[PDB]
Amino acid sequence: AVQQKLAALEKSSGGRLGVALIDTADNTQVLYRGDERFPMCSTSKVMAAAAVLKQSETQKQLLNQPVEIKPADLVNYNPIAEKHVNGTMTLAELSAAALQYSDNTAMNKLIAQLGGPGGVTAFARAIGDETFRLDRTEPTLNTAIPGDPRDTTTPRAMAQTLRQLTLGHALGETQRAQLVTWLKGNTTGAASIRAGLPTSWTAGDKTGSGDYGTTNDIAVIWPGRAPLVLVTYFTQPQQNAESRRDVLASAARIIAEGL
Numbered sequence: 001a002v003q004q005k006l007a008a009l010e011k012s013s014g015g016r017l018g019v020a021l022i023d024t025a026d027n028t029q030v031l032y033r034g035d036e037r038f039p040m041c042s043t044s045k046v047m048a049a050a051a052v053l054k055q056s057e058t059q060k061q062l063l064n065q066p067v068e069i070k071p072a073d074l075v076n077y078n079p080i081a082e083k084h085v086n087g088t089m090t091l092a093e094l095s096a097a098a099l100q101y102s103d104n105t106a107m108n109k110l111i112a113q114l115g116g117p118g119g120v121t122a123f124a125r126a127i128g129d130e131t132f133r134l135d136r137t138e139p140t141l142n143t144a145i146p147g148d149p150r151d152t153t154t155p156r157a158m159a160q161t162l163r164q165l166t167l168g169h170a171l172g173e174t175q176r177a178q179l180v181t182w183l184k185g186n187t188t189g190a191a192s193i194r195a196g197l198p199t200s201w202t203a204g205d206k207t208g209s210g211d212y213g214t215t216n217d218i219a220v221i222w223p224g225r226a227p228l229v230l231v232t233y234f235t236q237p238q239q240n241a242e243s244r245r246d247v248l249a250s251a252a253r254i255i256a257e258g259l
């Protein structure tokens with residue numbers, strides 16, 4: 001039923017849809033193209049922020065560390081970082097800016113703090129994600145070229161990792177709480193997964209988009225039942241395709257009605 005509905009949605013959308021649900025009530029999973037690779041785009045910002053949080057477990061002052069923002073550091077979407085040019089932002093501010101505003105300059109500073117895109121991948125491997133790969137910095141990590149393995153993961157792997165980070169023991173308790181607080185404070189998510197969920201439910205999420213009309217969202221959801229983790233990835237055959245947040249909302253609604 002749910003599988004057929006997601007297939008119909010995908011067909012009418014003209015693109016390629018990837019879905020992974022984990023229901024933590026009983027570990028049930030719903031997968032649609034769960035093991036195909038998709039470009040993560042800004043959903044990768046969660047892994048970068050989480051890695052810096054992991055570093056902060058052994059450097060308790062790390063989130064207070066100032067980082068210089070120079071004019072040359074500004075890239076293509078810098079809603080927070082542009083205010084601090086020729087000044088500084090703390091690693092906490094950079095994490096919040098990347099997660100809650102999807103600031104690309106902020107993400108680049110997180111990547112640099114981790115020793116480059118490979119440092120983000122190394123953290124993923126350390127927590128048991130063998131699928132995630134970050135290869136590039138912003139903005140080129142969002143090129144989303146069909147068939148390109150760079151900066152991709154699978155819906156199954158990202159759902160598992162998001163669960164470990166937000167509901168499991170990948171991070172210390174304080175760090176896990178901070179990540180959840182940041183995600184719940186996202187400003188960019190109302191039109192995506194959360195648009196397809198009952199209004200009484202609470203959630204945190206991280207969106208992403210790129211070329212090929214790539215439109216992504218990953219969410220942790222608190223419904224009268226145990227939390228859910230939901231990943232919805234979507235990408236289209238033409239480089240200049242329009243974003244389709246409505247497709248993510250539709251996939252989420254199909255999932256929610258199928259519960």
Ligand SMILES: O=C(Nc1cccc(-c2nnn[nH]2)c1)c1cccc(F)c1
Pocket residue numbers: 051052054055057058114115118119120122123124126127
């Ligand atoms: O894997 C990483 N850190 C990590 C992973 C798992 C456990 C721990 C740890 N911290 N204190 N004890 N163990 C650290 C990591 C963090 C930042 C950058 C990087 F490349 C790797």
Ligand SMILES: O=C(Nc1cccc(-c2nnn[nH]2)c1)c1cccc(F)c1
Pocket residue numbers: 042076077102103104139140141142143188207208209210211
């Ligand atoms: O950087 C890009 N997009 C971008 C930048 C900042 C935030 C987001 C975003 N989309 N949904 N959440 N965040 C997307 C980008 C778009 C097209 C091609 C490209 F190379 C990069």
